[PDB]
Ligand binder design. Structure first.
Ligand SMILES: NC(=O)C1=CN([C@@H]2O[C@H](COP(=O)(O)OP(=O)(O)OC[C@H]3O[C@@H](n4cnc5c(N)ncnc54)[C@H](O)[C@@H]3O)[C@@H](O)[C@H]2O)C=CC1
Ligand SMILES: NC(=O)C1=CN([C@@H]2O[C@H](COP(=O)(O)OP(=O)(O)OC[C@H]3O[C@@H](n4cnc5c(N)ncnc54)[C@H](O)[C@@H]3O)[C@@H](O)[C@H]2O)C=CC1
Ligand SMILES: O=CNC1CCCCC1
Ligand SMILES: O=CNC1CCCCC1
Ligand SMILES: [Zn+2]
Ligand SMILES: [Zn+2]
Ligand SMILES: [Zn+2]
Ligand SMILES: [Zn+2]
Lengths: 374, 374
């Protein structure tokens, strides 16, 4: 009854930076060739979406944000072969076109069709499927999940298990997979190692989950909000430290605690200074540091390259290094088989209409993941 | 005639920065417990030794520099078990104590007994074996090879094949092993890959040798001195580019040539700007960049962490990542078995007394490696 037709629905439109989202009616065009229109079931609030509001992450406005979500296919455009109406799906903020040099590389996952490096805020064809008050509205990372319906390119959606609980598995679309993969796939944490995790939000807790799964003997959580420590220990941290408690810089503290530096460190905040601190606290000859946090737009850090010359490895990754369309269904299957848990990340649940309250909870430090239900 | 006694011999003393080496008589104490006195045969002129003269690398002065060398054991102190009088040896500017956490780690080679991080310019016991004009003279990296005799700690010397040609294998003490290992062990260049090498001196040519040995399909040499290109092609470069020939920054040129970025890049110069350019020119999702060059003392580079967040890996290494005492004898044996060539690196051979002329050849751009003979 809606196939081929414009759908009018509610969405959370961001008209300008540093303002509440506006819950109001938008028009969602039907999918074109190789596009998929999705009815949203649940979406999480990730710090990246707040970065859009704050101007930390620059993408064209006005915009429908949201990128960590799950829903049910409402209709498919001409030529779609990988999903069907009625399928449960997770939108992929990093596409997997399967044809570019990165998709063909055994390690790479940052597909060249991404909308991150040179943000356009469009579908792959350079146009928008959203109208609001008669005005075109930008997409976000080819997902735009803060809406009752969205349209994504086929390379930006994965079919998942038909029995999946969408109010939980939406976290596999961003925060869980990012943190878990950063530990198990990017860093390749080893049994018996010592790890340090900077930032104990949804993504940092997922890093801890991955470090424990990889068998780390010590996992040191680092956060300036000590209210985050109890859940960090629940999911695997052996000891938590607040940098504000110490007179010395925390990388000196962590080097002392690890008897000369940690094996693996992770920056999961998004600050230039903590990226450098995290690199410095890994052991100078064989340590590995992974950047996960998003830096403020266009800003450069400063560092002494002797930190690298002694032997450190420094790297970063999007989405935990996972090839998105191959990996998301497998991660869902693994969740259904109880191989990892998502409940520890979910601290609050709200209806989509209370999106602004959900962002207030994030900004206040009270929440990890709030899940919004449509 | 000389065991247990002070040796008066010729050495090249550096009394202060930015002055020629002073060829004069020095006095070399006999070895104490666990020390080894070596009567040098050949020593190479490495850019690192020039960095001491120029103030790029800070180490206590006055000093006997030189660290890339080979000689013959004159005497051993109490407790030495790994070499004997008459053995051919190569001093190790990175020690291998075998006891610290780095030596025990499968990947690490930057032994915690090194004299680089906190330069003292002494023997392990904190004292000097050198006097000149009645003044104590500092050691350099526990080697000090610009002298007819030196004294090193046992952890800083390796015994090598009694039939080795010392006037060639001295290069295994630094330049060859550093460059070759940076490609084959640190970067782990893969066959069919595309590589970019910034700096075509002795170390950069050794990187090229390693990239070719690893089966790279394309090896792009980068140098502002085009006189370096002919030898780079002889040892495996498929193409050479001079940044000053182009209106665009060279990272953009290299990204275009490689159809979107190289697989492996190497900075083998020692400039902050080329360290960042080398990182930028590897492919953003799966590229690897290795810093080999020595940066100017205490200076920080500036970089955008988005270069790492997309997926790049940035690392550095001392001595090609080789565990020094284990690897040097094996590299000499490999040379004797004809597994790699050293002659392409040697452009000049001069008597030790012509040390200053040898440094003039390096500074003028004319030489690769000058070997000084005693
Ligand atoms: N690389 C990727 O693919 C992805 C990156 N991100 C980024 O990861 C970061 C974390 O995301 P979430 O976990 O949702 O964020 P979050 O805000 O829930 O967690 C961040 C934690 O860092 C702590 N923190 C803040 N400043 C600190 C400081 N100076 N020192 C120590 N701790 C400090 C906060 O108290 C907070 O608990 C964000 O920057 C986000 O944009 C998120 C998802 C995917
Ligand atoms: N990491 C380690 O273990 C080691 C590091 N090193 C360092 O490696 C570096 C290279 O050593 P060598 O080969 O002996 O030096 P070299 O001076 O013979 O070679 C350097 C090359 O860089 C080129 N160059 C200079 N500025 C340039 C620019 N802006 N762009 C492009 N090319 C430029 C020069 O023309 C020269 O050919 C030095 O900094 C040295 O201290 C050396 C040995 C061991
Ligand atoms: O949180 C999801 N996506 C992020 C990934 C890191 C760059 C900004 C967008
Ligand atoms: O060239 C020999 N040794 C160098 C290695 C890099 C740091 C300075 C000393
Ligand atoms: Zn996210
Ligand atoms: Zn692709
Ligand atoms: Zn050691
Ligand atoms: Zn050297």
């Amino acid at each position: 009854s809606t196939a081929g037709k414009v759908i009018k629905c509610k969405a959370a439109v961001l008209w300008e930076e540093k303002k509440p989202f506006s819950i109001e009616e938008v028009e969602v065009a039907p999918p074109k060739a190789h596009e998929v229109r999705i009815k949203m079931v649940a979406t999480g609030i990730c710090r990246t979406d707040d970065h859009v509001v704050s101007g930390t992450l620059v993408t064209p406005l006005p915009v429908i944000a949201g990128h960590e979500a799950a829903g049910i296919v409402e209709s498919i455009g001409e030529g779609v072969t990988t999903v069907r109406p009625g399928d449960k799906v997770i939108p992929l903020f990093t596409p997997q076109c399967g044809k570019c040099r990165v998709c063909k590389h055994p390690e790479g996952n940052f597909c060249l069709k991404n909308d991150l490096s040179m943000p356009r805020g469009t579908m792959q064809d350079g146009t928008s499927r959203f109208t609001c008050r008669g005005k075109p509205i930008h997409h976000f990372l080819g997902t735009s999940t803060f809406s009752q319906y969205t349209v994504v390119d086929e390379i930006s959606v994965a079919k998942i298990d038909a029995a999946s609980p969408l109010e939980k598995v939406c976290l596999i679309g961003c925060g869980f997979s990012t943190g878990y993969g950063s530990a198990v796939k990017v860093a390749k944490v080893t049994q018996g190692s010592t790890c340090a995790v900077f930032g104990l939000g949804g993504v940092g807790l997922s890093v801890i989950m991955g470090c424990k799964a990889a068998g780390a003997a010590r996992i040191i959580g680092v956060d300036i909000n000590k209210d985050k420590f109890a859940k960090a220990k629940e999911v695997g941290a052996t000891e938590c430290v607040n940098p504000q408690d110490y007179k010395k810089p925390i990388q000196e503290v962590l080097t002392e605690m690890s008897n000369g530096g940690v094996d693996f460190s992770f920056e999961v905040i998004g600050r230039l200074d903590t990226m450098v601190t995290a690199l410095s606290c890994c052991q100078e000859a064989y340590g590995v540091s992974v950047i996960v946090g998003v830096p403020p737009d266009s800003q450069n850090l400063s560092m002494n390259p002797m930190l690298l010359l002694s032997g450190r490895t420094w790297k970063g990754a999007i989405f935990g290094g996972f090839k998105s369309k191959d990996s998301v269904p497998k991660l869902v299957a693994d969740f259904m088989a109880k191989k990892f848990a998502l409940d520890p990340l979910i601290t609050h649940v709200l209806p989509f209409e209370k999106i602004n309250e959900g962002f207030d909870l994030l900004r206040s430090g009270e929440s990890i993941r709030t899940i919004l239900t449509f």
